[PDB]
Amino acid sequence: VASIKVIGIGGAGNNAVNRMIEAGVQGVEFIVANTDAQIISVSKSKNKIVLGKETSKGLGAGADVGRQAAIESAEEIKDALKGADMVFVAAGMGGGTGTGAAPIIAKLAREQGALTVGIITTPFSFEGRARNSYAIQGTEELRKHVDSLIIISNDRLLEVIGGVPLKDSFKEADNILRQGVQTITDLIAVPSLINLDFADIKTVMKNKGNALMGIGIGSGKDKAIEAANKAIISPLLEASIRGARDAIINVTGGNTLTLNDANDAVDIVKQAIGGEVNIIFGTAVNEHLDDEMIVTVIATGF
């Protein structure tokens, strides 16, 4: 029976430890260490460490504060890792705490006699250059003080979770944003059979707060029923559109879309919202849709 300890440092490490405690990882003692006394307080770990409670005074670490707060806490760290055969040092590189504290904790863990494995992420490219270069410095220092260093790139992780190359990892998000704008602006500014007046958009959207958006696409004989219901319970909705006081409905279709289809989609959304909702709606033509229609609802008033 080997003694295995995981010490999670900073935000990413604290996250990892909580997730291991919840998944019920067996036969491992967990430790959390963070300069931010707040994050520590609410942790699910039996073994808690506030780093450098002297200098930082527990008031976070920002983005040298990490290294110094680990040094100042060496005794609490040595005492929590004491007697381990293997120590995992878990951190996210790039931040204020994890970057500077991990190499110190690894050094202590290894000098005590533990087989010391660092496991770390490096930042997404969109986190910026300074953050990615701080991450590289911290990696090279951590490497000096571990037996082996498992390095997970958050860029490559995004490819795994999203299933697409990094270049395309936010295309779907970019596209929803495009749809959200276009849903409204086509009805105002692109002439079609049914446009909406700007004053009536204003009535739905002025001084409202949170506007819910659901998009749904459907095809075949029952496309209106499929499209409208998919928009009404879209995973993209913050909350239910039920009860909204005003809503905009954009019905988009190809050249074969019928008046009856558009009318059914509007009727479905009106019944789904219910009550005396004030509904306005318009249509848009998209000739690259083949026997499909898209229904978008923007609901306000809660």
Residue 112 interacting with a second copy (CB under 8 A): no
Rg (the chain; Cα; Å): 27
- Please, which residue, 102 or 264, has the CB nearer to a second copy? 102
Cα end-to-end distance, the chain, whole Å: 58
| Locus of tokens 């951190």 | 91
**Which residues within the stretch 26-45 sit at the binding site for a second copy (CB under 8 A)?**
26-28, 36, 39
Q: How far is CA 256 from the centre of its chain?
A: 39
Contact (Cβ atoms closer than 8 angstroms) between residue 224 and residue 264: yes
- For residues 168 to 207, the per-residue mask of contacts with ligand GDP, x marking binding by CB under 6 A and - elsewhere, is --x--xx-x-------------------------------
Query: For a second copy, which residue of 47, 137, 153, 278 counts as binding (CB under 8 A)?
Result: 153
The two three-digit tokens of residue 40, written as one number: 């520590």
The two three-digit tokens of residue 187, written as one number: 């009805």
Residue 103 interacting with a second copy (CB under 8 A): no
Distance (Å, rounded) from C-alpha 274 to C-alpha 300?
Answer: 13
Residue 185 interacting with a second copy (CB under 8 A): yes
**DSSP code at position 221:** T
Residue 86 interacting with a second copy (CB under 8 A): yes
Torsions phi, psi for 163 (to 5 deg): 75, 5
- For residues 80 to 99, the per-residue mask of contacts with ligand GDP, x marking binding by CB under 6 A and - elsewhere, is ------------x-xxxxx-
Smallest distance from the beta carbon of 42 to a second copy, in angstroms? Answer: 11
Contact (Cβ atoms closer than 8 angstroms) between residue 246 and residue 269: no
The interface partner of residue 259, options being a second copy, ligand GDP, none and the CB cut-off 5 to 8 Å by kind, is: none
Query: For a second copy, which residue of 18, 112, 137, 240 counts as binding (CB under 8 A)?
Result: 18
The two three-digit tokens of residue 279, written as one number: 């509904």
Residue 11 interacting with a second copy (CB under 8 A): yes
Query: For a second copy, which residue of 173, 220, 221, 290 counts as binding (CB under 8 A)?
Result: 173
What's the Cα-to-Cα distance from 284 to each of 48, 187, 189, 202, 251, rounded to whole Å? 58, 7, 11, 20, 6
> Which residues contact ligand GDP (rule: CB under 6 A)?
10-12, 15-16, 61, 92, 94-98, 121, 123-124, 126-131, 154, 157, 170, 173-174, 176
